[PDB]
Design a protein around this motif. Structure first.
Motif, PDB file in Angstrom:
ATOM      1  N   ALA A  53       0.825  -1.284  -0.101  1.00  0.00           N
ATOM      2  CA  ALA A  53      -0.237   0.124   0.288  1.00  0.00           C
ATOM      3  C   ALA A  53       0.792   1.685   0.081  1.00  0.00           C
ATOM      4  N   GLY A  54       1.770   1.271   0.959  1.00  0.00           N
ATOM      5  CA  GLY A  54       2.709   2.595   1.200  1.00  0.00           C
ATOM      6  C   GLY A  54       3.557   2.844  -0.581  1.00  0.00           C
ATOM      7  N   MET A  55       4.344   1.706  -0.852  1.00  0.00           N
ATOM      8  CA  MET A  55       4.778   1.613  -2.106  1.00  0.00           C
ATOM      9  C   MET A  55       4.059   2.017  -3.282  1.00  0.00           C
ATOM     10  N   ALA A  56       2.812   2.070  -3.565  1.00  0.00           N
ATOM     11  CA  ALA A  56       1.596   1.892  -4.691  1.00  0.00           C
ATOM     12  C   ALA A  56       2.006   3.370  -4.303  1.00  0.00           C
ATOM     13  N   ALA A  57       1.096   4.374  -3.438  1.00  0.00           N
ATOM     14  CA  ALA A  57       1.098   5.250  -3.013  1.00  0.00           C
ATOM     15  C   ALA A  57       2.568   6.422  -3.669  1.00  0.00           C
ATOM     16  N   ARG A  58       3.625   5.664  -2.893  1.00  0.00           N
ATOM     17  CA  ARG A  58       4.941   6.101  -3.422  1.00  0.00           C
ATOM     18  C   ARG A  58       5.501   6.100  -5.093  1.00  0.00           C
ATOM     19  N   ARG A  59       5.152   5.411  -5.478  1.00  0.00           N
ATOM     20  CA  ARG A  59       4.438   5.474  -7.040  1.00  0.00           C
ATOM     21  C   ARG A  59       3.766   5.446  -7.358  1.00  0.00           C
ATOM     22  N   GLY A  60       2.165   6.217  -7.028  1.00  0.00           N
ATOM     23  CA  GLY A  60       1.420   6.190  -7.568  1.00  0.00           C
ATOM     24  C   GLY A  60       0.800   5.365  -8.631  1.00  0.00           C
ATOM     25  N   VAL A  61       1.414   4.238  -8.638  1.00  0.00           N
ATOM     26  CA  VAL A  61      -0.241   2.678  -8.726  1.00  0.00           C
ATOM     27  C   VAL A  61      -1.250   2.744  -7.955  1.00  0.00           C
ATOM     28  N   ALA A  62      -1.822   2.444  -9.320  1.00  0.00           N
ATOM     29  CA  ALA A  62      -3.651   2.736  -9.296  1.00  0.00           C
ATOM     30  C   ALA A  62      -3.804   1.050  -8.848  1.00  0.00           C
ATOM     31  N   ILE A  63      -4.727   1.089  -7.930  1.00  0.00           N
ATOM     32  CA  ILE A  63      -5.755  -0.242  -7.542  1.00  0.00           C
ATOM     33  C   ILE A  63      -6.639  -0.421  -8.365  1.00  0.00           C
ATOM     34  N   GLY A  64      -7.022  -1.584  -8.488  1.00  0.00           N
ATOM     35  CA  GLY A  64      -8.506  -1.156  -9.674  1.00  0.00           C
ATOM     36  C   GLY A  64      -9.115  -2.942  -9.218  1.00  0.00           C
ATOM     37  N   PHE A  65     -10.523  -2.416  -8.990  1.00  0.00           N
ATOM     38  CA  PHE A  65     -11.370  -2.730  -7.763  1.00  0.00           C
ATOM     39  C   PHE A  65     -12.063  -3.364  -8.728  1.00  0.00           C
ATOM     40  N   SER A  66     -11.720  -4.904  -9.586  1.00  0.00           N
ATOM     41  CA  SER A  66     -12.720  -5.461 -10.597  1.00  0.00           C
ATOM     42  C   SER A  66     -14.095  -6.124 -10.308  1.00  0.00           C
ATOM     43  N   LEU A  67     -15.370  -5.990 -11.142  1.00  0.00           N
ATOM     44  CA  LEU A  67     -16.134  -6.778 -10.277  1.00  0.00           C
ATOM     45  C   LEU A  67     -16.033  -7.782 -10.593  1.00  0.00           C
ATOM     46  N   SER A  68     -15.855  -8.481 -11.846  1.00  0.00           N
ATOM     47  CA  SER A  68     -16.072  -9.773 -12.405  1.00  0.00           C
ATOM     48  C   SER A  68     -15.728 -10.807 -12.095  1.00  0.00           C
ATOM     49  N   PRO A  69     -14.165 -11.246 -10.795  1.00  0.00           N
ATOM     50  CA  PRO A  69     -14.682 -12.299  -9.859  1.00  0.00           C
ATOM     51  C   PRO A  69     -15.913 -12.158  -9.819  1.00  0.00           C
ATOM     52  N   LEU A  70     -16.501 -11.661  -8.721  1.00  0.00           N
ATOM     53  CA  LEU A  70     -17.807 -11.246  -7.948  1.00  0.00           C
ATOM     54  C   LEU A  70     -19.154 -12.352  -9.254  1.00  0.00           C
ATOM     55  N   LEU A  71     -19.237 -12.452 -10.094  1.00  0.00           N
ATOM     56  CA  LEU A  71     -20.004 -12.408 -11.385  1.00  0.00           C
ATOM     57  C   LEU A  71     -20.348 -14.296 -11.092  1.00  0.00           C
ATOM     58  N   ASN A  72     -19.106 -14.218 -11.110  1.00  0.00           N
ATOM     59  CA  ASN A  72     -18.530 -15.839 -11.366  1.00  0.00           C
ATOM     60  C   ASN A  72     -17.949 -17.594  -9.820  1.00  0.00           C
ATOM     61  N   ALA A  73     -19.295 -16.755  -8.863  1.00  0.00           N
ATOM     62  CA  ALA A  73     -18.645 -17.014  -7.985  1.00  0.00           C
ATOM     63  C   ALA A  73     -20.029 -17.577  -7.597  1.00  0.00           C
ATOM     64  N   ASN A  74     -20.153 -18.418  -5.889  1.00  0.00           N
ATOM     65  CA  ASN A  74     -21.080 -18.577  -5.618  1.00  0.00           C
ATOM     66  C   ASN A  74     -21.184 -17.778  -4.545  1.00  0.00           C
ATOM     67  N   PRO A  75     -22.003 -17.977  -3.234  1.00  0.00           N
ATOM     68  CA  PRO A  75     -22.025 -17.086  -2.179  1.00  0.00           C
ATOM     69  C   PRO A  75     -20.932 -17.030  -1.578  1.00  0.00           C
TER      70      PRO A  75
END
Length: 212
Positions: A120-142
């Motif tokens: 998390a620290g390195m991502a902020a200092r490197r300006g790297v974005a985090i992608g929250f994909s919805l895709s895995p949630l569609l292909n899953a059980n409860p």
């Protein structure tokens, strides 16, 4: 700036792209790229040119188990956003370290977030974005959805604390997996985002990247 402005950062299918173009102000077409190991550069640029002429904005999603490829692709400076598929801890780290545009779903295919105070620290200092994909949630059980949602909650809390850039995306591989801005913001709220935070994940943070 506009309050109701929305950007879809990751769609991987023709029909999905044409469909999403009605609901979002900008739609980035992502070319999925499996490597073991290197390109193939002359062919890649020919494809990217064809993709840029077809879709306009193009992202390149690297899926691989070799950290050295992330650095190698980053060094060539291609006319495309460089995404990296999360899931492997060496990959998650190397994607961050190399200053890539975004790390998509660091939890992907894991029993944990794949993200911690260190990353998390390195991502902020490197300006790297985090992608929250919805895709895995569609292909899953409860059960599977509850595991994924927990990981997304842990990653969000870290992202939020370290002020890491982020966006919500469908990462759609078919027309059926594309969801509108309001639904993508509901994923944000489910993960623990406030209303303006969810809005910024489709508006402000994509604008920081797509200027290209």
């Amino acid at each position: 700036f506009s309050r109701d402005y929305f950007v879809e950062m990751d769609v991987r299918d023709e029909e999905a792209h044409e469909l999403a173009s009605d609901w979002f102000d900008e739609v980035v077409f992502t070319k999925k790229l499996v490597l073991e190991d290197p390109p193939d550069w002359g062919s890649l640029k020919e494809e990217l040119k064809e993709l840029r002429g077809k879709y306009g904005k193009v992202a390149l999603l690297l899926v691989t188990r070799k950290p050295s490829l992330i650095r190698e692709v980053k060094s060539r400076n291609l006319k495309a956003l460089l995404y990296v598929q999360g899931g492997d801890m060496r990959i998650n780290r190397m994607a961050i370290e190399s200053g890539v545009d975004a790390l998509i779903s660091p939890w992907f295919g894991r029993k944990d977030p794949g993200f911690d105070h260190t990353l998390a620290g390195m991502a902020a200092r490197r300006g790297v974005a985090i992608g929250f994909s919805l895709s895995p949630l569609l292909n899953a059980n409860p059960y599977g959805r509850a595991q994924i949602l927990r990981f997304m909650m842990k990653t969000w809390q870290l992202v939020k604390k370290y002020r890491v850039p982020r966006f919500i995306t469908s990462s759609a591989e078919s027309r059926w997996e594309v969801r509108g801005p309001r639904d993508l913001m509901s994923l944000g709220i489910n993960i623990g985002m406030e209303i303006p935070e969810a809005r910024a994940s489709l508006n402000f943070y994509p604008r920081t990247i797509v200027w290209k």
